[PDB]
Amino acid sequence: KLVQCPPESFDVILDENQLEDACEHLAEYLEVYWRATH
Amino acid sequence: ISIVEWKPFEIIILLTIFANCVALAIYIPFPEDDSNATNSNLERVEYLFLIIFTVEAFLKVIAYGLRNGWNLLDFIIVVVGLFSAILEQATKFDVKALRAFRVLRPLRLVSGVPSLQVVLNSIIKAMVPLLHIALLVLFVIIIYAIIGLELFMGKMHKTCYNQEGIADVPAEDDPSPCALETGHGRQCQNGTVCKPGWDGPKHGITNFDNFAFAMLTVFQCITMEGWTDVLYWVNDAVGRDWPWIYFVTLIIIGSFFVLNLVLGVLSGEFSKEREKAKARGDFQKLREKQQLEEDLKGYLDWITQAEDIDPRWNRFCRRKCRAAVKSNVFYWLVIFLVFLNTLTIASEHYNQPNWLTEVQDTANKALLALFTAEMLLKMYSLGLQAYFVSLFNRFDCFVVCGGILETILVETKIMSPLGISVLRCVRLLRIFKITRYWNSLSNLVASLLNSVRSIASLLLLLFLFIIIFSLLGMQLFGGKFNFDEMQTRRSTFDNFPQSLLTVFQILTGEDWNSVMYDGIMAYGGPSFPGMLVCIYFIILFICGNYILLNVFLAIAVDNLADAESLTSAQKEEEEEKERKKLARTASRIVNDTIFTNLILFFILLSSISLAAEDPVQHTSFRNHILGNADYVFTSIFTLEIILKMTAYGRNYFNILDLLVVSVSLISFGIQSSAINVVKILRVLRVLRPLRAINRAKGLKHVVQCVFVAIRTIGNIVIVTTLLQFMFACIGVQLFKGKLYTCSDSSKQTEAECKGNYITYKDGEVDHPIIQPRSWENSKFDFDNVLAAMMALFTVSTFEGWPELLYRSIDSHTEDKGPIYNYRVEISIFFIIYIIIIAFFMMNIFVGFVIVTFQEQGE
Amino acid sequence: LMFVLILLNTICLAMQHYGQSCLFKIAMNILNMLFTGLFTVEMILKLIAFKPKGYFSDPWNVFDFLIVIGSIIDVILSETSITFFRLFRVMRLVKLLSRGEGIRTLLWTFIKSFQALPYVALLIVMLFFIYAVIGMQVFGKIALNDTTEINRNNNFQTFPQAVLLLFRCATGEAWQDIMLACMPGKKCAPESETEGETPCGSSFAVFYFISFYMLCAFLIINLFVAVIMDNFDYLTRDWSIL
Amino acid sequence: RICYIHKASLPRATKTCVENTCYKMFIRTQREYISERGCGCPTAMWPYQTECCKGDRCNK
Ligand SMILES: CC(C)CCC[C@@H](C)[C@H]1CC[C@H]2[C@@H]3CC=C4C[C@@H](O)CC[C@]4(C)[C@H]3CC[C@]12C
Ligand SMILES: CC(C)CCC[C@@H](C)[C@H]1CC[C@H]2[C@@H]3CC=C4C[C@@H](O)CC[C@]4(C)[C@H]3CC[C@]12C
Ligand SMILES: CC(C)CCC[C@@H](C)[C@H]1CC[C@H]2[C@@H]3CC=C4C[C@@H](O)CC[C@]4(C)[C@H]3CC[C@]12C
Ligand SMILES: CC(C)CCC[C@@H](C)[C@H]1CC[C@H]2[C@@H]3CC=C4C[C@@H](O)CC[C@]4(C)[C@H]3CC[C@]12C
Ligand SMILES: CC(C)CCC[C@@H](C)[C@H]1CC[C@H]2[C@@H]3CC=C4C[C@@H](O)CC[C@]4(C)[C@H]3CC[C@]12C
């Protein structure tokens, strides 16, 4: 349901099959977005 | 009757075929019409088998009125079986020799299994492109046979006969051709006379007397087995000046060029089949299987550890377990433990000190306990079944299970299988993971495990071929290799295991001409009807070598190409991933042309100079010229470097030139201890030919290409070395201190084998000879690991391996002599080593070279 | 017709057995004379038909011309010896081989690929030369004992003999036996000059004979695969297509 | 004590030694040449063999 539909809504997309690099992907986006409104 | 022909009737007949194949193995061909009770029963069982395959060919005959080849084979087998049985009962030409048709029954095991029929068709359809090479080989054989007929016709019929009569060949036990005083060959000299009239080097079989004999000799030489024997016999016969031009040219043309043609045609056919089957997309299923497994453990561990972060006491129980396995310290600790296990396993040797045998038994138990503890620690922290999911983890689990099974025996016999701790050395192959090419070795194993079904089918067809030819050889030469010679042949067809060993030895091509001569003499001698039996050996050799090539090259080429494609796709996906990740987060005349040449000519002259020296005569007038000729040669190269050394200040080939010229100049002096140092820097004079590199364009290119190829194949070399070391350790466990023997066969200990004993010349009781008793070891033994590595190397080269095999079969107990045919079941070790190393690893290496040359260039 | 004549000549050459009677020998001599006369007749016919310029244009003709002239003067020296001149009759059988479009193309393509890579074989030549020289310097003094693997036929005492020994080892005949015969402790050459009872030989033999085998196998495989990859266009042809 | 002793291979020169066992070292194929002599019952490597004794100057 959330695959055949276009991504569009997901501002950032997590494509990782392991917890380790999946954590770094979310933290990468949050940290950069954290500095936007400051 | 067309109703009961599709129900398990067809499996009942298949089981009937399997029991008419386990009744042709139990049969023992006895010499001179002897028999026993088991044979007396096997006759009646074969009567029953004949009745069954008759009313089953009748049903199909009167059901569909003999067109298909397999059904035609069925019919002919049945009719000749009935004919042979009826004729045997009526006579109760050779009657019993018509039973050779019964060995065609195992050929039906593939007609009832279409899955085997398809691989048989695949093997057969590759014969058509090789018919041109077969015709070329036939033409070359004919031409060389005619040349040998015109050159050495009836010139090897004279041997030394002693100056007292013509009784029998008084020139050693292996007489050789000679020549007269007016001849040019070998001279008998002393108390011997080269008298005409003699059978021949091999009872008159090896010679160029006839066109058939010449053709057989040429074929035997072309097979590269025992061609130096023929060359040396010809040298003794006609002279040592111009038979090398014949034999070396024959070897180069008919054995190396022909092998190159066969390899090229087979590689082209395999590539065409690969490119035709790739269109279907069989690689995609293998490709999609790897990523489905990579994300499997990557998502299961996420589920596993998230449970432990919780929302019984697992917070202080699970973090360390998964943070120690992935800590990079547990990895190196386990690697060190495996290195210690290899150290203690490989330290075993014959007659070791009494402290070592205690150290390596305490350390074995300690390391076993440590590895069991580590396995249990890892077994629960990553899921009981997810731990079983991994590939190498299955190997570890099996190794631990077998080690625990074999370490608790301590009471039973034969503890050689307890050393399955050697397979723990495979676990250290994770050292490839730290380095590169780990995705090139593991991909190969993945492809092998994916194609294991076709691998087993291909290995089963070869086994069926070997079984059929073993049964045929047991029928033809069973109980016939019993002549009056004092020595008993070891490669015979007396039993089924012995026939299997003989057929395997002929397939490897080692000493197959000796077995051919034994078979020829068992049917008379060099005569027209008797010598027609060599067709069996010729066909066996050709067909077996062709089948082995088509099997072991196809497996290697297909699996290696699949692994390389997998690695390329994985590299592409990694590149795309790490690129898309980065695409978002970021936002003097020595330089002349003729001179150079003139000095590459000097270089050639200098290389020619030291090839013309006198190796044996220390002082000879020829070396007077050559020794003083190098003086002026070294001056030119000395002048060349000085004329260049001012131009610059250094590359890697000027270093080699300096290492040559300085060594030569210092060797001009030295003096003092002119025994040791001179004998090192005189052999260091072999670097002059290597100076053609960097001075002749193209030589540098091919040298660099060969270095790149070496760097590419180093991984396969390392894996083969590891397997050889493991097999050497297993062989050390099996045959440590057991391959000793005494010249007197009646003594089985070193203390007993002392003094003198009486021998008889040719076993003539009237001619006794005193000889000293000696406790001797095998030429290549298994006393320690180093002594076993080289024995296994010589076995892999197929050189003298039957002698080692039959020496190891007789060995039974440490420090004691041999027993005839003690453990015939130990030949499985040698068979497995030959199959894995000499057949699979070599063809894998060749296919790797082929693939790495194909993916370069095009 | 001339192909059949060549086949008949080859069959006639193929039945020269040992202990043949005098009538057989005379018949063979006269039949060889008849065949060489017929082939001279063909040659004359094709100097006329094709003129003396068009004859020596096909390379299959100069080879044929050289073959028969070695047969005409063979009879001259036969009635009144040298064994080299009677080998020309056998060499004529290659015309039959070079008639099928498959074997001809295969041999021609592989020969061209062999010619196009003259240094991949120079590597093997250099390896053989270096190892022959090293063997001559090291094991070149061992005695020639007829009961040992170092003897008159197999030894290191000459460069051709050392090269032949290395060729035999590359074929893999008894290389382990030669290595064991090259180990230290052998009484050796009386023509080289106490305490030296058996002081020659060396323990270098193991490394020598193992490294030579590995390097020779590797270089032979390299040459084979290089030739195959050079000729790979013909090996994967798909003859059905244009 | 003085069973023929050595450590090297070429000169065959004696050495200090003890123990009641003294041996011979030779190549299996080249039997009629003793490569090394000493004491004890050491383990050869390749292609050598060891033949040990019980008394002084037994190895000969
Ligand atoms: C095994 C497969 C190839 C089928 C069997 C074919 C062979 C082995 C068979 C078919 C024809 C048979 C031969 C037919 C006739 C003769 C002549 C006689 O005086 C002795 C038996 C002998 C010599 C037979 C031996 C076995 C034989 C050669
Ligand atoms: C860790 C793995 C890869 C390598 C193991 C190497 C060690 C344990 C092995 C390799 C070769 C072995 C030697 C081979 C032969 C001899 C000669 C004799 O005196 C017995 C011991 C001795 C000296 C062995 C001792 C152990 C040894 C040195
Ligand atoms: C190997 C198989 C598949 C094909 C070759 C068939 C072989 C086994 C057959 C075909 C011709 C046969 C030979 C024909 C004639 C004779 C002469 C006779 O006095 C003894 C048997 C002997 C010598 C036969 C032995 C078996 C033989 C060599
Ligand atoms: C292409 C290159 C490597 C070829 C090298 C060929 C050289 C090394 C060969 C070719 C012919 C050879 C000579 C041929 C004949 C003899 C006579 C013999 O009693 C001593 C060696 C001697 C004098 C040889 C010395 C080495 C030699 C000169
Ligand atoms: C394809 C054919 C024609 C090639 C040549 C084969 C024929 C002609 C050959 C091969 C076998 C030969 C025979 C084999 C054995 C002998 C015994 C000998 O004491 C006299 C010659 C004689 C009788 C030979 C005569 C020639 C021979 C029949």
Ligand SMILES: CCOC(=O)C1=C(COCCN)NC(C)=C(C(=O)OC)[C@@H]1c1ccccc1Cl
């Ligand atoms: C490069 C060729 O080396 C060999 O000939 C090997 C043989 C003999 O050749 C096999 C002939 N059937 N025996 C053993 C066991 C080998 C070895 O020790 O590997 C280090 C090598 C080998 C080396 C690298 C890759 C494959 C192979 Cl079969």
Ligand SMILES: *[C@@H]1O[C@H](CO)[C@@H](O)[C@H](O)[C@H]1NC(C)=O
């Ligand atoms: C070497 O040859 C001589 C010559 O007869 C012989 O006496 C000697 O025994 C041979 N060497 C060996 C080890 O047999």
Ligand SMILES: [Ca+2]
């Ligand atoms: Ca061999």
